[PDB]
Design a protein around this ligand. Structure first.
Ligand code: HEM
Ligand SMILES: N[C@@H](Cc1c[nH]c2ccccc12)C(=O)O
Length: 376
């Protein structure tokens, strides 16, 4: 899946991202590099305001334009939120806004830090000989110290990598169906299930490397966007680029292609019925890179694995299919427990919004659970 920007090892994640830019953009790198202490001192907003209006013409390859998006994205957040106490900026300087809006228009990603920036491009191997594990990995950027950004951004990425083991099997599934190869398909569906079962254990690591109170109070506010945010009721104005303010949602893991990829594969019609859940998951594809957005297209336009499996009156083929759907439920069911610990409880500790966040996630899980065949 080379044309779709899918890697065999790390899937949707950027295979090995650049850690620095061409020297013409040293102004940018310095602010991004030293955010944690630039925020504490009132410098940051000054250091952004007095800055050159650099052009994006000296960004040659993809990995250059992505690190640019990450750097600009990370800075744009810290500017708008500051120390993160309700001290906000309602306007972005044209010195940083224009290059970010042009570079964003270029990659077809919106002008705001997305999952593709702060998880998929925001990582490196410490020792390139030892494998991909929290031990031997570090993010390129943070917001503060003790924001637990390393934990969230890397455990997210490690789940993207766990999913890669299943995502690379997908072409075997479609080959097998067309070539009426039952035995090949059963293994490939059992293989996908097995890899999604592994991805669940990877999810447990979040308890080890992320602190609820720190996460909820610190990192969550920088990852916060400006769609339906009363802090910025009419969104944010990108000075000189857009006439009037624009609204764009924050950098959630809900911009991940992993879960949406296997919903489409298994014929789980999430983005049908025209509910809030369906409308949310459809909107999040705007915040995915255009290559991945096209990949979920290809999956949709292929013949249904679901309606194929049901035809054959084959118990083995149904069980293998179910195993993939159960694996996907288990992941969503566990993710609800995570949100309970990391959103709901924290939000009740500090002096019905969280009630229908849980309804959104439970809707999406229930839609998945309804696709189970149960040998019928
Ligand atoms: C402390 C950890 C986490 C918290 C607090 C958290 C919180 C949330 C919340 C509140 C949502 C609802 C959508 C939104 O508000 O934008 C969401 C959605 C989502 N999260 Fe997470 N999340 C966490 C970890 C993860 C991880 C590690 C993954 C791995 C891929 C993940 C994948 C998703 C996906 C795919 C959605 C979209 C809805 C769905 O398809 O079920 N989350 N998350
Ligand atoms: N997408 C949210 C931000 C958000 C909600 N829940 C999250 C969990 C993790 C990270 C970010 C978030 C916004 O509009 O601003």
């Amino acid at each position: 899946s080379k044309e779709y920007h899918i890697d065999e090892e790390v899937g949707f994640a950027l295979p090995n991202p650049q850690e620095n830019l061409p020297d013409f953009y040293n102004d940018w790198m310095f602010i991004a590099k030293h955010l944690p202490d630039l925020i504490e001192s009132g410098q940051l907003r000054e250091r952004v305001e007095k800055l050159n209006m650099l052009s994006i013409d000296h960004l040659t390859d993809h990995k250059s334009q992505r690190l640019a998006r990450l750097v600009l994205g990370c800075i744009t957040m810290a500017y708008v939120w500051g120390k993160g106490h309700g001290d906000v900026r309602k306007v972005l300087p044209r010195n940083i806004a224009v290059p970010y809006c042009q570079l964003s228009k270029k990659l077809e990603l919106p002008p705001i830090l997305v999952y593709a920036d702060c998880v998929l491009a925001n990582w490196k191997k410490k020792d390139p000989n030892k494998p991909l594990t929290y031990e031997n990995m570090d993010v390129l950027f943070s917001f503060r110290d003790g924001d637990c950004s390393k934990g969230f951004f890397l455990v997210s990425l490690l789940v993207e990598i766990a999913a890669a083991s299943a995502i690379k099997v997908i072409p075997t599934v479609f080959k097998a169906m067309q070539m009426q190869e039952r035995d090949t398909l059963l293994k490939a569906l059992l293989e996908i299930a097995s890899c999604l079962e592994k991805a669940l254990q990877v999810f447990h690591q979040i308890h080890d490397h992320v602190n609820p109170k720190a996460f909820f109070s610190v990192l969550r506010i920088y990852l916060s966007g400006w769609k339906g945010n009363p802090q910025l009721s009419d969104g944010l104005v990108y000075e000189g680029f857009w006439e009037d303010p624009k609204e764009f949602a924050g950098g959630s893991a809900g911009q991940s292609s992993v879960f949406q990829c296997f919903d489409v594969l298994l014929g789980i019609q999430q983005t049908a019925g025209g509910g809030h859940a369906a409308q949310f998951l459809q909107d999040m594809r705007r915040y995915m890179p255009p290559a991945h957005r096209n990949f979920l297209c290809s999956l949709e336009s292929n013949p249904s694995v679901r309606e194929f499996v049901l035809s054959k009156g084959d118990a083995g083929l149904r069980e293998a299919y179910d195993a993939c759907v159960k694996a996907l439920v288990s992941l969503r069911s566990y993710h609800l427990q995570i949100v309970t610990k990391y959103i709901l409880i924290p939000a009740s500790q500090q002096p019905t919004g969280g009630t229908d966040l849980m309804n959104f996630l439970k809707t999406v899980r229930s839609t998945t659970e309804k696709s189970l065949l149960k040998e019928g």
